[PDB]
């Protein structure tokens, strides 16, 4: 309408400062290891400080706010799903995966996850497409058609950027039907 929100950007290089979607995405914890001890910071992480090496779960924004090319403050590991482990099962058939149970922001998180200069960055990206361009169909076919419990069951498996495509296609199919009528 007249309300044009700030669209996402998590799929491009950086996020969008004012994007509600992006702040929401970047708030998902992440597998992170400690390097140098951090005093005072021991009350929040209930286990006066935090030893070096501690395995932690930190918001993608925090982990990214501390990470650098020296790992002199943080160590990070590619979450189990972005690992070549599943990166193969997706290659098999993506249109079966439950991209919602897994990281709800599958694509967005995956993209921002590149900053951590992982060596295997390439292989990830060359899968963030293989799994989208691979599901592009079942998503469109669901949007460009009236609701049924096949979409109510399909939707329960799309991630946050797909549930979005879903709506959009569900919008034009409902703009034209609100026209084809009287």
């Amino acid at each position: 309408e007249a309300y044009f929100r700030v669209e996402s950007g998590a799929l491009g290089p950086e996020e969008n400062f004012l994007s509600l979607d992006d702040i929401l995405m970047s708030h998902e914890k992440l597998p992170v290891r400690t390097e140098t001890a951090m005093p005072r910071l021991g009350a929040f992480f209930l286990e006066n400080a935090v030893p070096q090496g501690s395995k932690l779960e930190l918001p993608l924004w925090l982990a990214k706010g501390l990470f650098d090319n020296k790992r002199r403050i943080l160590s990070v590991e590619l979450p189990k799903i972005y690992q070549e482990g599943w990166r193969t099962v997706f290659s098999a058939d993506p249109n079966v995966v439950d991209l919602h149970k897994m990281g709800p922001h599958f694509y967005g998180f995956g993209s921002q996850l590149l900053h951590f200069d992982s060596p295997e960055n390439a292989d990830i990206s060359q899968s963030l497409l293989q799994t989208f361009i691979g599901r592009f169909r079942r998503i469109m076919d669901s949007s460009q058609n009236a609701y049924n419990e096949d979409t109510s069951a399909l939707v329960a498996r799309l991630d946050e950027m797909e549930r979005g495509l879903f709506q959009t296609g569900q919008k034009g199919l409902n703009d034209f039907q609100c026209w084809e009528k009287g």
Binding site: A2, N16, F17, S19
Partner: protein
């Protein structure tokens, strides 16, 4: 030019500004003219059936003119920072994609928004962090976005741009 042509043009500058993801060049002519042609009619207008037919043609002439500017305002507000300056940073020799009315508006827009942020919460923040560079807070029009151009087809706007 001719009424027939004029209007025809408006429907171009209208649809162009509606498929292009960025505040296109200001066409203050097509605008002030159709504005003039219309008022011209409203006069000669104030028979029955004849008049009525002219009013109907006007509600359409109006519709597009409005739908048009209404689209521009939406764009400037959606990018008030990259516009209020984009003009100042446009080589004098090119078309100001923003007019003198849209100027005092895009200008007013920020002076209202900025004051809001500050007063409401941005000023009660820890010193050396109470200011925000809207020039980077608000996203810029994505030129690299796919559109539809008319032999008609679709492809990233940047390349065509």
């Amino acid at each position: 030019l001719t009424p027939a042509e004029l209007i025809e043009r408006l429907e171009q500058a209208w649809m162009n500004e509606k498929f292009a993801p960025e505040l296109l060049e200001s066409k203050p002519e097509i605008v002030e003219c159709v504005m003039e042609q219309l008022e011209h009619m409203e006069e000669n207008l104030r028979e029955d059936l004849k008049v009525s037919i002219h009013q109907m043609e006007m509600e359409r002439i109006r519709y597009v003119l409005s739908s048009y500017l209404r689209c521009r305002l939406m764009k400037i507000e959606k990018f008030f920072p990259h516009v209020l300056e984009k003009e100042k940073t446009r080589p004098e020799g090119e078309p100001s994609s923003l007019s003198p009315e849209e100027l005092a508006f895009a200008r007013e827009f920020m002076a209202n928004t900025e004051s809001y942020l500050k007063n409401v919460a941005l000023k009660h923040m820890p010193p050396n962090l109470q200011k925000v560079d809207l020039f980077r807070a608000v996203p810029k029009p994505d030129l690299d976005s796919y559109v539809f151009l008319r032999s008609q087809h679709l492809i990233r706007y940047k390349t065509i741009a």
